[PDB]
A paper describes a structure:
MLLs degrade N-acyl-L-homoserine lactones (AHLs), molecules that are used in a microbial communication system called quorum sensing (QS) to coordinate a variety of behaviors, including virulence and biofilm formation. We provide the structural and biochemical analysis of the lactonase [name] (WP_017434252.1), isolated from the thermophilic bacteria [name]. [name] is a thermostable, highly proficient lactonase with broad substrate specificity (kcat/KM values range between 104 to 106 M–1 s–1) for substrates such as N-butyryl (C4) L-homoserine lactone (HSL) and N-decanoyl (C10)-HSL. The binuclear center, common to all MLLs, is coordinated by five histidine residues and two aspartic acid residues.
We report here the kinetic characterization of several variants, including Ala157Gly, Ala157Ser, Gly156Pro and Ile237Met. While some of these variants show only modest changes in lactonase activity compared to the wild-type for several AHL substrates (e.g., Ile237Met), they show altered kinetics for specific substrates, resulting in changes in substrate preference. To gain some molecular insights into the effects of these substitutions on the active site configuration, structures were solved for both Gly156Pro and Ile237Met variants. On the other hand, the Ile237Met variant shows a slightly altered conformation of the Pro234-Asp240 loop, in the vicinity of the amide group of the AHL substrate. This conformational change is more distant from the atoms of a long acyl chain AHL substrate, and this is, therefore, consistent with the minimal changes in catalytic properties recorded for this variant. Following this, when considering the locations of the amino acid substitutions performed in the variants studied here, two of them (Tyr223Phe and Asp122Asn) are part of the first hydrophobic subsite where the lactone ring is accommodated, Ile237Met is located at the second hydrophobic subsite, and the rest (Gly156Pro, Ala157Gly and Ala157Ser) are located in the third hydrophilic subsite.
Residue numbers in the entry:
A (entry chain A): 9 to 283
B (entry chain C): 8 to 283
The structure:
């Protein structure tokens, strides 16, 4: 039945303390400990499903970087994004002969700059997002916050393009989107409200798309190593452990948000698909 | 009641500023290998000489914490070194006030971190007041034979061997009137598993809130609030800081932070006097 494509949406760099909290602490014999600017991949997933095409995440906006870019300069220097034209999401979809108007459902894991970048392309889709994440992002917009992980100009475009929203409620059960495709309601942790995805493929079997609920394999452990970028510490831990249980009980792979080694291994959209 | 409140200097500690102020100086494209700093801060305790009986808030570090024969693990000693002359040790500070450990009726343990619960074992004639969630969490560290981290196995060992008398504050228990104008504040989860504070109403000085590690420094307090890297419950921490800010406003109280160097310098310490 379905076909699942991994699309390469370029690379981002940032302080590795964001990724792994207190990774290299200062000591009496190393009092001025230095950090490192680590590279990690930005990616999206397309599930070409009989019942309709499902897109997980949307990467960054093409108009994000540069002196005429949407991102504030402080954001550009703290979380720089590098991508060729081939990396842009509209192009990756074009090379698969898929038009934006063909996307039935977009699942926004959360509304950070590197996942919600291109929501505005999908004017014929239902956009699925946690309600707490939505509220949080809209407050950023209304309070006219121009820095941080929530891009004012992105949100501005969502409203102008008249996107059709479907909020997952705080205490809402998981949503069966299609045969073998479930939206997981992870709630608060990394951000205000996280969504994941469990995909059951005939040949490949079970896949959990965790997004920023688990950055990397180092995050996952055990033991768990939580990030510096975090809203609800307790929630974050509960979520990781919950994914570990689901993985075991359903014999599923766990696909992390930004794991460089794992990403290299993936079969990309320019080479083929999973089935 | 006409009490006297004393601030006692129990030495200094140093650690990565990222523990104290999370992501205080993040790396950027043009400064990729940004360095941190190793900041110094005070360790102190408060004595309330009250007519109904003497109350002690926190107990600093154990005299035999540091060194090759030290209770603290080497890794701990290197990340959180404590420097203190003999006169800084709690038992000496009390002596210089003609106070013996057996004179202490109540010990309020803000939490059970290495720099607050170090000297509980001295007070075998007191009721030790502690948050039940903090007490439980420390005991698990003990039972699991965890020898590294902020909860000192040898300290806990001694509390047990010395048969301390405990009184746990329950998770949803209200504030506890310990004496005229002395209330134990139940802050719950945040920096650690279970935080306690103290509100003190002095005739002359007025209101005082002892926050301990619920609020590290003035930099923590803001506004805006700047949370620590050393954090268990992030939401609870934020909730607690705003709660303290409210109480402070409504009761016209000063807020004494856990480890503010500037504020500590301005305090009248036990070698100079007290607060009435
Ligand atoms: Co994110
Ligand atoms: Co502490
Ligand atoms: Fe991300
Ligand atoms: Fe402390």
């Amino acid at each position: 039945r379905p076909k699942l494509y991994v699309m390469d949406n370029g690379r981002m760099r940032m302080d590795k303390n964001w990724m792994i909290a207190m990774h290299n602490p200062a000591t009496i014999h190393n009092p001025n400990a230095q950090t490192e600017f680590v590279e990690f991949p930005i990616y999206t997933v397309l599930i070409d499903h009989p019942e309709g095409k499902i897109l997980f995440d949307t990467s960054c906006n093409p108009n994000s970087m540069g002196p005429q870019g949407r991102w504030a300069e402080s954001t550009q220097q703290m979380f720089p994004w590098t991508a060729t034209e081939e990396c842009y999401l509209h192009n990756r979809l074009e090379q698969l002969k898929v038009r934006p108007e063909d996307i039935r459902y977009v699942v926004a894991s959360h509304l950070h700059l590197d996942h919600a970048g291109c929501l505005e392309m999908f004017t014929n889709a239902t956009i699925i997002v946690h309600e707490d994440e939505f509220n949080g992002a809209l407050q950023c917009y209304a309070r006219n916050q121009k820095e941080g992980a929530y891009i004012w100009a992105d949100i501005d475009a969502w409203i102008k393009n008249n996107l059709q929203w479907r909020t997952v409620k705080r205490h809402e059960d998981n949503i069966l989107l299609a045969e073998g495709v479930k939206v997981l309601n992870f709630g608060s942790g990394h951000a205000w409200g996280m969504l994941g995805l469990h995909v059951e493929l005939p040949e490949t079997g079970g896949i959990i798309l965790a997004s920023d609920a688990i950055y990397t394999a180092e995050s996952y452990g055990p033991p768990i190593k939580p990030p510096g970028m975090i809203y609800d510490s307790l929630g974050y831990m509960n979520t990781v452990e919950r994914i570990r249980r689901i993985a075991q009980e359903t014999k599923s792979q766990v696909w992390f948000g930004h794991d460089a080694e794992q990403f290299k291994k993936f079969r990309k959209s320019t080479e083929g698909y999973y089935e």
